[PDB]
């Protein structure tokens, strides 16, 4: 219904280390009147999965109720059901894969009875994307238009495929549940074809839970882990992916990692870069790095210090009229400056340019 007059750019961070992993996250409200994103980051899991980890981004719609309940409870719905536990020993590929499906369906029904019982007024829904990381497998999980990727060996090794209504199997399901896809939207309103919650979209008679207008069924992919080649995993809501592609962001994160090992800082840079590339949505990013994540380079740090200083001089020189920040950005862009961060471009450097603009024209 509304945007803010000015963006809420305050970042919320977390970070941790364990099972050979390091992780950082950053969430920001941005231009939207509410923050309806949520996340989960836990290293070491209950009930004998000490050496497992779990990370997840939740993009909530029509309120944050569903997103928040998921962020605190999706994991135990996933690991504490007979499908995940099942077979006598350690959980197999199938156990894990079926366990997540059950987890997804059962928490959905759980939330439906809770809402029915307590007479809930919110009509919210949420995407989930994440990884369950075991000693030898990364299991990617997706439900909605949030997205995850694996950077392996300097390249995009795998990414999750967003559930858009106009996708062929999604459209088919929607049509069979008596709906249509109008442009990109389920009956002209809903932009996503899979989510937790959205219970009004889940009331077709004589169609299973996975056969409704909006499905809670996750897509799960088993990637075998690689001690030598596994570099980092990026999970983010569409607030990020709307304005940056797989290759770009993966190239950009690499560039940043070659400058800091501070993961919260890298995530802040993803989020600011995205706000400046024009994103007007809530943004949340998680960055999980593996032992062979890119390393800090003495040279890349110098190049960044050089580039920073260069951008400071241009600003000072561009001010002879006294142009506003917007106009300085325009001018700087039309200079076609070399060596800007890959993917990030000029946008990834606005905090540096702006801080300087302020040093010189503070009023
Ligand atoms: Mn949202
Ligand atoms: Mn969003």
Helical content stands at 25-40%
Q: Classify the beta-strand content into a percent band.
A: 25-35%
H and E string: EEEEHHHEEEEHEEEEEHHHEHHH
SS-based class? alpha+beta
Biggest β-sheet, characterized?
A: 6 strands, antiparallel
Bound compounds, each kind once, are: manganese (II) ion
Number of domains: 2
PDB class: hydrolase
Keywords: phosphatase, Alternative splicing, Hydrolase, Magnesium, Manganese, Metal-binding, Phosphoprotein, Protein phosphatase
Assembly: monomeric
Entry title: Crystal Structure of Human Protein phosphatase 1A (PPM1A) Bound with Citrate at 10 mM of Mn2+
Write the layout of secondary structure elements.
Elements: E1 3-18, E2 21-32, E3 37-45, E4 49-61, H1 65-79, H2 82-85, H3 93-118, E5 125-133, E6 137-143, E7 147-152, E8 155-159, H4 168-176, E9 181-182, E10 185-186, E11 196-197, E12 219-224, E13 230-236, H5 238-241, H6 246-257, H7 263-276, E14 283-289, H8 298-318, H9 325-333, H10 350-360
Antiparallel strand pairs: 1-2, 2-14, 3-4, 4-5, 5-6, 5-11, 6-12, 7-8, 7-13, 9-10, 13-14
One manganese (II) ion (MN) binds near residues 59, 61 and 282.
